[PDB]
Each structure stands twice: as C-alpha cells, then as structure tokens.
Amino acid sequence: GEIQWMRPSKEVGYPIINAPSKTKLEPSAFHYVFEGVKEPAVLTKNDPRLKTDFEEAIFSKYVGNKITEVDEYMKEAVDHYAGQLMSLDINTEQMCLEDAMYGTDGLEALDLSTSAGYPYVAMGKKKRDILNKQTRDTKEMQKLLDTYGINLPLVTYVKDELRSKTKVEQGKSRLIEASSLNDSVAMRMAFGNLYAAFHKNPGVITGSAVGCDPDLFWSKIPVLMEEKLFAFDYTGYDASLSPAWFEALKMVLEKIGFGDRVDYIDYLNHSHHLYKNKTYCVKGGMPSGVSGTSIFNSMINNLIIRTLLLKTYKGIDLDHLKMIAYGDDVIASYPHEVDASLLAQSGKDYGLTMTPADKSATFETVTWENVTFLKRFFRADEKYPFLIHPVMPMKEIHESIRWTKDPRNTQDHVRSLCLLAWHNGEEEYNKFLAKIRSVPIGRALDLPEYSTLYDRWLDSF
Ligand code: NA
Incomplete structure (x- = not known):
C-alpha cells in the first residue's frame, strides 16, 4: 500500500472530520492488583508522551507497493x-x-x-x-x-x-x-x-477461521493439519498489500x-x-475496518502462502497444504518440513515482510507445543485428551483488566477475561479470581468458578 x-x-x-482526542481508557479497580505496562495509545499529535512526529508514525505503515502485476x-x-x-x-x-x-x-x-x-x-x-x-x-x-x-x-x-x-x-x-x-x-x-x-x-477448505468459536474449534484444528506445522508473523500486513x-x-x-x-x-x-x-x-493496502476486511485478508493470505510455496518449492503439492488464516494470522501445515526463513525471503519480493512466529528472534520449528493461533496455545485436556484447550497466557489478560472504557461494563469485561483465563488451569484461575476479589469492585461481580466453566465447556461440544 x-x-x-x-x-x-x-x-x-470535503469537510473537516472531528474525531475524539481523549482516550476512554482509565485505570480500573484492578490497576494495582495486577501487573501490566501498557497504556492508552496516542490519539493526537500533541500527546506529551510522543517522542516523534505523530502523523508520520501512523502513516508509515504504508511501506509502498512491491509488485504491479x-x-x-x-x-x-x-x-x-x-x-x-x-x-x-x-x-x-x-x-x-x-x-x-x-x-x-x-x-x-x-x-x-x-x-x-x-x-x-x-x-x-x-x-x-x-x-x-x-x-x-x-x-x-x-x-x-x-x-x-x-x-x-x-x-x-x-x-x-x-x-x-x-x-x-x-x-x-x-x-x-x-x-x-x-x-x-x-x-x-x-x-x-x-x-x-x-x-x-x-477450516482448511475456506482456509479461514473468521467467525469461529475457539472453545469448540480448537479441538477440530489438529485433525485438519498435516504432519509438519509452519507459521510466521507479518509486519503491517494490511498496509503492505500490493x-x-x-x-x-x-x-x-x-x-x-x-x-x-x-x-x-x-x-x-x-x-x-x-x-x-x-x-x-x-x-x-486493505482498509483495516471495512466490512469483509477479515475475510478478504484471509483469502489473500491463502493466495500469498500458496504463491510463496510455489515460488520456493516447485513441485509442492498444494492439495496437502493445510492452512487456516484469520486475517494475517495463520496456522499452516504440510506433510514435509519447509523453511519459513526461505519463504520469508521469497515474501519480500511480493511486498510482504515476514518474521519468526511469535516474535522469535530466529525462525524455529513450529510444534504443537509452541504454536499459537489468535494468541492462543493448544493444550489437550488432562482428563479428556481429545478435547483441546485454547490457552491465552495470563499476561494479556492482566494487561486488559487493569483498564476500563466504561464502569458500567466492568462485569461483562471481567467475565470475558474469565472465559479466556480459566483455560490456564484451576490453580491459575483461582489465583486470578482471588486477586479480583481483593478489592470491593471485584467482590461485587458475579463470576463463574472453575468447575462451573469446565462443566460448561464439556456440555458445549
Ligand atoms: Na487501499
């Protein structure tokens, strides 16, 4: 782009379009109960925290176009x-x-x-x-x-x-x-x-995961991926599309x-x-936000990966390329091992900037133990192995609970986080609930206990 x-x-x-200049984000009742380092993003060129030109930074995502035809x-x-x-x-x-x-x-x-x-x-x-x-x-x-x-x-x-x-x-x-x-x-x-x-x-036919329910979908994914997994991240995916x-x-x-x-x-x-x-x-550049955005980005991702595989590995069998995308995020597989580093190289020539899956410094082998999709890991349930837990690390959740965009939605916000956190295990989940309940606001919320979420989970399949 x-x-x-x-x-x-x-x-x-065209008329001047007025936009909010002040964030709706503010410290929540749990701001000091949980650790976090994130703050509200800069929303105006006059923000005191800025250390560089604002307008220049927000538009730099348009790295240009690398291919015409x-x-x-x-x-x-x-x-x-x-x-x-x-x-x-x-x-x-x-x-x-x-x-x-x-x-x-x-x-x-x-x-x-x-x-x-x-x-x-x-x-x-x-x-x-x-x-x-x-x-x-x-x-x-x-x-x-x-x-x-x-x-x-x-x-x-x-x-x-x-x-x-x-x-x-x-x-x-x-x-x-x-x-x-x-x-x-x-x-x-x-x-x-x-x-x-x-x-x-x-799934792997649409090669898309948009509109999916992680709690249920995670158990279906492994049975859709071939033997060898591969993945990588994109830098400014949407804006980089030629x-x-x-x-x-x-x-x-x-x-x-x-x-x-x-x-x-x-x-x-x-x-x-x-x-x-x-x-x-x-x-x-894909207009991030427009209707269909997610789906079209997913479709284009299916085209990109297929293209890089054809360009890099002539004779590759795309019928055995099993991938699921959600916009730029992707989890892919092939019967044989492939080099993400090589694919990344081929990617540059197509206007795509690809890097190691999950901020790794080097391109490492992707396994079921370290792979993530939508920031979630995959973990087989201890009691029923065929049930797969989508596991989002507590760090993301801690960062989110420390802020609020509307005191009236505290209950919904915290319940939402609970549906993500319980998958980390009962020991972790209870520690989470205890901290929430260490302050008045938290004690007044109606939150589900662990065994309640586990039962609900099993009854949802
Ligand atoms: Na555009």
Missing part, C-alpha cells in the same frame, strides 16, 4: 484456492437489503454502535436513526443509498486501545478505516452469502461466481480516505 497524495480536505470538497505463481495459487472454494457450493446470489442490514444465518446484523462513516458522521446522523432491529426497516437505508450512492470516502480514526511504552513513544498507534454505511450495506449485499459461507465453514494481491483476489471471486461484483474490490484497493482535516488517496 502507498499513499498517492494527501492534502486539505477543503481543497477537494499477477505473476505465474499467483495465477497458480488463484486456480488452486478457487477450485478448493468451489467445493463449498457457495451461493453466488446477491443478498437482499434486509438480511445484509439485519442479519441472516451465518451473518450477524450490522453493528449499531460503530461509525456510520461519511457523510453521516459529518451530518451528525447515526446508525440508530437509520435502522430498526425490531422493524427490519429498509426504507430509510434505501432512500440513503439512492441519495448518496456508493464508493464514498473512508473515515480514518485512531484506535483507542492499549499499546506498549515503545509504541506509545514512537507514535505507533493503529488506525481504523470506517467505510460509509452505504458501502458497507452495498458490500454485504454483494458478498453477503460469501461471508455467511465462510462463517459457517471455518494492488496485484487485490487483482488475484478478484480472479478468485470471478472463478467462484462473483465476477459479477469484483468492482467492489477496487473500492478497497484504490481507496479514498478522510483524516481530520486532510484527505488522501491510497494505492493498495
């Missing part, structure tokens, strides 16, 4: 992945406006709390004033579609979240690209059935029956953005 130009929004006919290996990757998706019999029909708006089997309704994007965000008009979940009314929406059309600018927001000290000082805050409600609705109508098919089919990857994606879509609406992918690839009082144009 590469920013073509950037300039005052007024010069191109779709080469021989990419076409091969496209044919193989498309043929594989072909076996799911995905309904290629367009999804009606009502379902695209309020949901249907395999697709949740539109999130009524997130931004409505441009121009609504500039007219002070919110989603709540456009759709009614009880009515499933599509009259206002329709009227808005006809009035403002599609292919509207995306609104760039800084993500209000916890970041490390380094990332705070280096102004490395992440950005959200809120697309207009019109495009979101248009895209969910165009790809609604594709999204549904993926959500209902997490236009060629979007073209490769459209080819996949064409081959599976959606060639009818590949133009919507151009909207993602060559995108128009609004940030504060500036407007900019980007060539390449």
Whole structure:
C-alpha cells in the first residue's frame, strides 16, 4: 500500500472530520492488583508522551507497493484456492437489503454502535436513526443509498486501545478505516452469502477461521493439519498489500461466481480516505475496518502462502497444504518440513515482510507445543485428551483488566477475561479470581468458578 497524495480536505470538497482526542481508557479497580505496562495509545499529535512526529508514525505503515502485476505463481495459487472454494457450493446470489442490514444465518446484523462513516458522521446522523432491529426497516437505508450512492470516502480514526511504552513513544498507534454505511450495506449485499459461507465453514477448505468459536474449534484444528506445522508473523500486513494481491483476489471471486461484483474490490484497493482535516488517496493496502476486511485478508493470505510455496518449492503439492488464516494470522501445515526463513525471503519480493512466529528472534520449528493461533496455545485436556484447550497466557489478560472504557461494563469485561483465563488451569484461575476479589469492585461481580466453566465447556461440544 502507498499513499498517492494527501492534502486539505477543503481543497477537494470535503469537510473537516472531528474525531475524539481523549482516550476512554482509565485505570480500573484492578490497576494495582495486577501487573501490566501498557497504556492508552496516542490519539493526537500533541500527546506529551510522543517522542516523534505523530502523523508520520501512523502513516508509515504504508511501506509502498512491491509488485504491479499477477505473476505465474499467483495465477497458480488463484486456480488452486478457487477450485478448493468451489467445493463449498457457495451461493453466488446477491443478498437482499434486509438480511445484509439485519442479519441472516451465518451473518450477524450490522453493528449499531460503530461509525456510520461519511457523510453521516459529518451530518451528525447515526446508525440508530437509520435502522430498526425490531422493524427490519429498509426504507430509510434505501432512500440513503439512492441519495448518496456508493464508493464514498473512508473515515480514518485512531484506535483507542492499549499499546506498549515503545509504541506509545514512537507514535505507533493503529488506525481504523470506517467505510460509509452505504458501502458497507452495498458490500454485504454483494458478498453477503460469501461471508455467511465462510462463517459457517471455518477450516482448511475456506482456509479461514473468521467467525469461529475457539472453545469448540480448537479441538477440530489438529485433525485438519498435516504432519509438519509452519507459521510466521507479518509486519503491517494490511498496509503492505500490493494492488496485484487485490487483482488475484478478484480472479478468485470471478472463478467462484462473483465476477459479477469484483468492482467492489477496487473500492478497497484504490481507496479514498478522510483524516481530520486532510484527505488522501491510497494505492493498495486493505482498509483495516471495512466490512469483509477479515475475510478478504484471509483469502489473500491463502493466495500469498500458496504463491510463496510455489515460488520456493516447485513441485509442492498444494492439495496437502493445510492452512487456516484469520486475517494475517495463520496456522499452516504440510506433510514435509519447509523453511519459513526461505519463504520469508521469497515474501519480500511480493511486498510482504515476514518474521519468526511469535516474535522469535530466529525462525524455529513450529510444534504443537509452541504454536499459537489468535494468541492462543493448544493444550489437550488432562482428563479428556481429545478435547483441546485454547490457552491465552495470563499476561494479556492482566494487561486488559487493569483498564476500563466504561464502569458500567466492568462485569461483562471481567467475565470475558474469565472465559479466556480459566483455560490456564484451576490453580491459575483461582489465583486470578482471588486477586479480583481483593478489592470491593471485584467482590461485587458475579463470576463463574472453575468447575462451573469446565462443566460448561464439556456440555458445549
Ligand atoms: Na487501499
């Protein structure tokens, strides 16, 4: 991805977009009960903690574009992945406006709390004033579609979240690209059935894990991965995607029956953005935040890995490449050992910056003991080995509980953490509950005991 130009929004006919400048994050009742080092990300150029230009840091993710066209290996990757998706019999029909708006089997309704994007965000008009979940009314929406059309600018927001000290000082805050409600609705109508098919089919056929339930899905994964596992991390995956990857994606879509609406992918690839009082144009780069983002990033990941394997290991048998992606995150396997370091090398030529799985310093062999997916390890249950525990380390959880974005959601926030933490074992879980209950706020929460979560887990399969 590469920013073509950037300039005052007024010069191109756009209003200044006002965005929050103060974080909603504040020390929670457990701030000093648990250890942590993360703080709220910088949200403005005038933040006292900044040790470098803010605007420069937040846009540096656009490292540029390394490839213009779709080469021989990419076409091969496209044919193989498309043929594989072909076996799911995905309904290629367009999804009606009502379902695209309020949901249907395999697709949740539109999130009524997130931004409505441009121009609504500039007219002070919110989603709540456009759709009614009880009515499933599509009259206002329709009227808005006809009035403002599609292919509207995306609104760039800084993500209000916890970041490390380094990332705070280096102004490395992440950005959200809120697309207009019109495009979101248009895209969910165009790809609604594709999204549904993926959500209902997490695994090695879609090569996607979006819409999955770790508690249940973890037990299915091992029986889907071949003998040798391999994985690696990406640096600025979304922003690094070159236009060629979007073209490769459209080819996949064409081959599976959606060639009818590949133009919507151009909207993602060559995108128009609004940030504060500036407007900019980007060539390449996936708009992190847009509807379908997760799925399209996952699809492109399936193309990338296949491409690097073809380029690096001619004669590789893609039919035995078993991988599951969730955006840039991936867990892959092959009957034979492969060199991630070599693949990483090939990756550079495709505009991808690949590094050792889980911040390792060197490319080490990935095993079932050290592999992670969505920050979770895999651990067989001591009593019933066929049941696999998704284990997220307590560090992440400790960092999160020390802050709050709304005192009214303390119960939900802490319960959420509990559903992640109990998998670390009973000894650990109880220590966690005890600390929570060492302060008044914690003692007033209704939290599930270990044996309760274990029983609930077994009863969920
Ligand atoms: Na883009």
